[PDB]
Amino acid sequence: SIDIHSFIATHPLNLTCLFLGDTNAGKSTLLGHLLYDLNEISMSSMRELQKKSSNLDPSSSNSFKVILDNTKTERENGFSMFKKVIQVENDLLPPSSTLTLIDTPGSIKYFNKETLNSILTFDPEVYVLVIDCNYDSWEKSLDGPNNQIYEILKVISYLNKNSACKKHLIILLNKADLISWDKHRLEMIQSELNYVLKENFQWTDAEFQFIPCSGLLGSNLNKDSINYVPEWYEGPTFFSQLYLLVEHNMNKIETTLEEPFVGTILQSSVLQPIAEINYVSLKVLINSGYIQSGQTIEIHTQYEDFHYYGIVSRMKNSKQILETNTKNNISVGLNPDILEVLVKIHNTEDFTKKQFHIRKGDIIIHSRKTNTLKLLALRLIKLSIQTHALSDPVDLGSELLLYHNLTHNAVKLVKILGTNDISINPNQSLIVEVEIIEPDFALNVIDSKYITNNIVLTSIDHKVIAVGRIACQ
């Protein structure tokens, strides 16, 4: 009836680029300007955005960043608070491809809320580290070994050890206009980062590159001296490098048919009013495999016990910052599509007394109705971690935060396997056990060769201690 095989063959190959950096770096601005350069923002829509920007703080706002800072609360505050996911598909990209651009907040409060988890949730092929090269800003942004830029590097430099894939880091030396493309300054900043990346974080030349730019003026983003690229610069533009990365990503082995279906619930809303049969609208990021309408699924909550059996009523494209068609129904969802998935669930019990609570970070899988997918609910969690630079050792009984997929939970360090050591130390590779502190909470873990289960351990103050993976066995 339906050719599952054919749908996968006509599915464009996606590349995901994740933008990272401190607040005020210019991530939202640059990324808004990029979208404009790719003709994803109409002239009419643009003029409306300048008007909005006129009514806001002229110290914080411009017409490009308001494209990404599109919530009422972010516009009044003047900085990003929520991660944005934009999928681009047009004739400026390689054929049969999509470019996913992800914005993340830099302000430390919302960085700790969303950004670290975005790295683990969306599993980007490319990191884009945006840096403010304006005078005094750069010097202020590297205070000690735990500055916010190094905290980013303490994660992305060490994820997915043993490779099978290689890292791709683009460092955007931004706001070059505010320094009139000071050659010796840009070279200095580049020299400094190059050393740290190589000596402290073990990056190799092929894995990264520097690109000077101005996200506001659009200098060197794509294709009498302002909005100019100086004569001495002979490197590539930002988008040219993005293009190549998407293109080289084309030659990637696609194992979708083999993969089991796994999806992460990014957002959930129960249609009102509630009834004997209820309909839940889920925003789902597909982690692996595929899902088609009419199939039976299982929703597993972070609330330790709850599990819901339901049927996929319909699926739609998720609402995006760019204009898309959310009216039409989709037959098939594929890794890494983000879809609206309407789930039909029949209440076993009285529907008024007991109402289900489906939260972000919960997973959805195909129903194991009565090769079956192994699913674990863990309170005591074994972790295969590796440390590097550590200011202070981490003793047993320490309280930590465990980042996994879209969730972060307080845990207690309860055991260090294979040794009588009483603490985690610098530059080690350990097997460790942590315990969920929160009552009636359990971490959902899928044991499969097609799921990474990367994690990050931080202190309560959100200082990265180690990177690792859930050890299921």
Ligand SMILES: Nc1nc2c(ncn2[C@@H]2O[C@H](COP(=O)(O)OP(=O)(O)OP(=O)(O)O)[C@@H](O)[C@H]2O)c(=O)[nH]1
């Ligand atoms: N002169 C100049 N200013 C820029 C440039 N890019 C961004 N800005 C300004 O820098 C400020 C911060 O820009 P944002 O786009 O909000 O940077 P951000 O990294 O997204 O900030 P967060 O969302 O808080 O992480 C804004 O007031 C912009 O007008 C640039 O290329 N040149």
Ligand SMILES: [Mg+2]
């Ligand atoms: Mg922003």
Ligand code: NA
């Ligand atoms: Na900002």
